[PDB]
């Protein structure tokens, strides 16, 4: 089911030679199709196999690894691309894992904010401490959660924007959902951000609960 696509989330800028690779399902020289999926829209087809042949999109077939080398990159193309094959077995159709191209810009560091839970919430019975990585470029960032100097795991949730229309950066939302009882049992809460933009892990914290 899971076809292997070699780029997973690789980014470049407009007017760039970018190549995406697909692992095949069975072995036999089969047929290949690729699709563009812009966010919130239905996928559209690009090319087909055998006779592969605008000027930019072009497909190539290397051994068991099919490729979609787009040469002239226009801003209209920044989207996700999927690789699909027909397998003459169960009459089944199988897709690649998808590969997204996001815009490439200079490196921006996150604006890190921490918010303790609201009093309006802890009376209800749950505490949701939230961390805010604000407009940053590299999209790759580790957000470690330290309650009383202990990196707690298995409770946080993450969320990212797609990209701002002006600066083309991201934002992250780490949400820790601790019980009211287990929230007031500890005092210092901290959010640790490790990112490429910052030289050393920057942490912003608060002190309440006991």
């Amino acid at each position: 089911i899971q076809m292997t696509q070699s780029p997973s989330s690789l980014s470049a800028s407009v007017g760039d030679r970018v190549t995406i690779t697909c692992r095949a399902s069975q072995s036999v020289s089969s047929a290949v199709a690729w699709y563009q999926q812009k966010p919130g829209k239905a996928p559209k087809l690009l090319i087909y196999s055998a006779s592969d042949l605008p000027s930019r999109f072009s497909g190539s077939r290397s051994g068991t690894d099919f490729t979609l080398t787009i040469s002239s990159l226009q801003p209209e193309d920044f989207a996700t691309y999927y690789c699909q094959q027909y397998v003459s077995g169960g009459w089944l159709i199988t897709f690649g894992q998808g590969t997204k191209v996001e815009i490439k810009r200079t490196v921006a560091a996150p604006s890190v904010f921490i918010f303790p839970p609201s009093d309006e919430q802890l009376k209800s019975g749950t505490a949701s401490v939230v961390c805010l990585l604000n407009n940053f470029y590299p999209r790759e960032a580790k957000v470690s959660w330290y309650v009383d100097n202990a990196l707690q795991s298995g409770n946080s949730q993450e969320s990212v924007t797609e990209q701002d229309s002006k600066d083309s950066t991201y934002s992250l939302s780490s949400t820790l959902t601790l019980s009211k009882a287990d929230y007031e049992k500890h005092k210092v809460y901290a959010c640790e951000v490790t990112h490429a933009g910052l030289s050393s892990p920057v942490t912003k914290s608060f002190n309440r609960g006991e």
Binding site: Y35, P43, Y48, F95, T161
Partner: protein, 226 residues
């Protein structure tokens, strides 16, 4: 000038059934293979079923075998996908697509089959044993002093479609409404944040308006430094 129109989707709790439909327009349904392909929220594409409507040939993916029934109506030009004994993780957007032809191609050379030229736009199917509940909205209130940021936390609401704007359409620049993530409780949770100058606190009022049409619920929380 041809198109695919897909209907049927909606919310149903796991174990129930929910039949889909695919109206086809402008081309001859019986000379084009028809496939159902789904995509879980934020996940990739996963093929579900395929039909050759003329001869009735049917083909399924083994993740779903024994539950879904793909079918076609040549007289009504519409392909169906009966989804039965629905499971919790079936939640996805179900797309309807086209392929070419060839009785000869189907049997003998199926690998060398051409692409899916036209797709519809989608119908959404969510499965959850959770009643629809309006969101409880919580402020974030920054205590930080240049440019500081504040926001809201809408949590524990079912089903998805929730909208957040700031000051009734005023605060547009710097509005970063995140995408919701469904909590372990089965209900979704979401946060919106905005960037403003440090001078604005004590001078400007900040209120987020959160509408939840499925629950018929509108909520307003003023966010003020503590």
């Amino acid at each position: 000038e041809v198109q695919l129109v897909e209907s049927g989707g909606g919310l149903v709790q796991p174990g129930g059934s929910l039949r889909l439909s695919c109206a086809a327009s402008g081309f001859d349904s019986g000379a084009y293979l028809r496939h159902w392909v789904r995509q879980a929220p934020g996940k990739g594409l996963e093929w579900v079923a395929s039909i050759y409507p003329s001869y009735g040939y049917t083909s399924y993916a083994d993740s779903v075998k024994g539950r879904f029934t793909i079918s076609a109506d040549t007289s009504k030009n519409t392909a169906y996908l009966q989804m039965n004994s629905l499971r919790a993780e079936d939640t996805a957007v179900y797309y309807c697509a086209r392929s070419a032809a060839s009785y000869y191609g189907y049997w003998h050379w199926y690998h060398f089959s051409p692409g899916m030229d036209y797709w519809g736009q989608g119908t959404l199917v969510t499965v959850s044993s959770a009643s629809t509940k309006g969101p409880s909205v919580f402020p974030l209130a920054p205590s930080s002093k240049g440019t500081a940021a504040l926001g809201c936390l809408v949590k524990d609401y079912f089903p998805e479609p929730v909208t957040v704007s700031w000051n009734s359409g005023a605060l547009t620049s710097g509005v970063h409404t995140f995408p919701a993530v469904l909590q372990s409780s089965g209900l979704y949770s979401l946060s919106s944040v905005v960037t403003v100058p440090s001078s604005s606190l004590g001078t400007q009022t900040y209120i987020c308006n959160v509408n939840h049409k499925p629950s018929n619920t509108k909520v307003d929380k003023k966010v003020e430094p503590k």
